Design a protein around this ligand. Structure first.
Ligand SMILES: O=C(O)CNC(=O)C(=O)O
Ligand SMILES: [Cu+2]
Length: 289
């Protein structure tokens, strides 16, 4: 709960320098993926949250309370009220006409310990549980956003809702007060279009009976400067708080469209491993053409 942190971030390593362009989600090998590392400054915004919104910067920290407390049972979450409570809040915060909550991802493993525990495991093995997303990314590219819409909605509702303004937003809530590996978000205005690279993202569920689940992300080019990209986080985020992260917005002028984000360690990290859920939401404004 210092004013800032200077931490090494993981950015896109160009293929010319040895990089690859497949993000193997949930696998051991992704933890060994190579990156272009750069030191960036992340400003603590605890107390300054009112100066950040999804329209300008693409992200927002909100006070939102929920009755749900246990998050590691995927089935119990999907069949409980959590998705509906996220919907009501997001609809209220965004003024959306309709909110579709598609799913969530639970993270609870410590990054370093998992690297150690899995150092002899084959690349394509899938960890039991999920570690922090410790690299700069946007969960959906522009192409990936369209791909998700038609994968997560019926074909005709996806075609109807594509005719009005729609957006993808992750709602990130910790299981408890964050005392290690917080979540950094990057001002959408401070990253140019030509720094974004459509990067394919695969999860080999049910292999070999099924092709790995397909997704397309933004990878982000490294900055020349610690402050070229404008990074922010909020220290001590509690389970009563939600970090909204706009991955995509169909509206090209007048609103932020994509937020690079990444978990990061601080030297003041302590306590049992950070646990969180990020719930993926489609947001629609059927008023807006
Ligand atoms: O929590 C983490 O470590 C990473 N989370 C995300 O990237 C997200 O919510 O989209
Ligand atoms: Cu993410």
């Amino acid at each position: 709960e210092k004013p800032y942190y200077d931490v090494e971030f993981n950015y896109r390593l160009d293929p010319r320098d040895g990089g690859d362009e497949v993000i193997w989600g949930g696998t051991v090998g992704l933890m060994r993926r190579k990156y272009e590392t750069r030191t960036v400054r992340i400003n603590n915004e605890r107390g300054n949250e009112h100066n950040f919104n999804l329209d300008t910067h693409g992200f927002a920290w909100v006070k939102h309370k929920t009755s749900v407390t246990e998050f590691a049972d995927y089935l119990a979450i999907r069949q409980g009220p959590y998705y509906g409570e996220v919907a009501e809040m997001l609809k209220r915060v965004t003024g959306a006409t309709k909110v579709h909550v598609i799913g969530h991802l639970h993270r609870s493993l410590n990054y370093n310990d998992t690297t150690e525990e899995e150092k002899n495991a084959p690349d394509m093995t899938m960890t039991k549980g999920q570690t922090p997303g410790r690299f700069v990314h946007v969960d959906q590219s522009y192409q990936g956003a369209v791909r998700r819409l038609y994968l997560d909605l019926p074909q005709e509702e996806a075609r109807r809702l594509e005719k009005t303004r729609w957006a993808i937003i992750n709602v990130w809530r910790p299981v408890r007060k964050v005392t290690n590996e917080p979540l950094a978000v990057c001002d959408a205005r401070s990253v140019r279009e030509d720094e974004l690279f459509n990067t394919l993202h695969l999860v080999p569920m049910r292999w070999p009976d099924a092709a790995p689940q397909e997704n397309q992300m933004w990878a982000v080019a490294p900055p020349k400067t610690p402050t070229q990209h404008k990074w922010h986080y909020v220290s001590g985020m509690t389970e009563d708080e939600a970090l909204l992260i706009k991955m995509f917005d169909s509206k090209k002028d007048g609103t932020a469209r994509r937020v690079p984000h990444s978990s990061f360690p601080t030297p003041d990290d302590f306590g049992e491993p950070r646990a969180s859920t990020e719930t993926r939401c489609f947001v629609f404004w059927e008023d807006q053409e």
